[PDB]
Design a binder for this molecule. Structure first.
Ligand SMILES: C#CCNc1nccc(Nc2ccc3c(c2)N(C(=O)C2CC2)CCC3)n1
Length: 113
């Protein structure tokens, strides 16, 4: 299912999904690693940080062998955000918006495989 090996043509689809996420108006908090100057305790709280720039590096290097691994990294971004930030924080709302967008794009990618 979602465990099949990613082909080179799959990787063109993954690049497009990632670029759509990076261009979303609510993606700004996720574009780069969390700066500890903006959240001093963040890296003691979150033990597996993730961000869209790290995923872009991984896509360029063909890090992902299965689509599940790509979805797992994307899910970490949103899970870390909802765990670190309170439910009324604007950051929490950004994760809400961007995760539903990612699901919309992912369904598109899967249908096109
Ligand atoms: C605006 C601005 C500063 N510049 C910048 N640039 C690019 C991304 C970015 N993310 C950012 C900024 C502040 C904070 C965060 C992230 N945290 C998050 O948990 C967000 C879910 C990722 C932790 C605490 C507060 N910040």
């Amino acid at each position: 299912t979602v465990l099949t090996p990613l082909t080179e043509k799959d990787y063109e689809g993954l690049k497009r999904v990632l670029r759509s996420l990076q261009a979303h108006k609510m993606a700004w908090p996720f574009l780069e690693p969390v700066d500890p100057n903006d959240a001093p305790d963040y890296y003691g709280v979150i033990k597996e940080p993730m961000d869209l720039a790290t995923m872009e590096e991984r896509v360029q290097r063909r890090y992902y062998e299965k689509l599940t691994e790509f979805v797992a990294d994307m899910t970490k971004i949103f899970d870390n955000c909802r765990y670190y930030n309170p439910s009324d924080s604007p950051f929490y709302q950004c994760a809400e918006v961007l995760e539903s967008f990612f699901v919309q794009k992912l369904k598109g990618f899967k249908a096109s495989r």
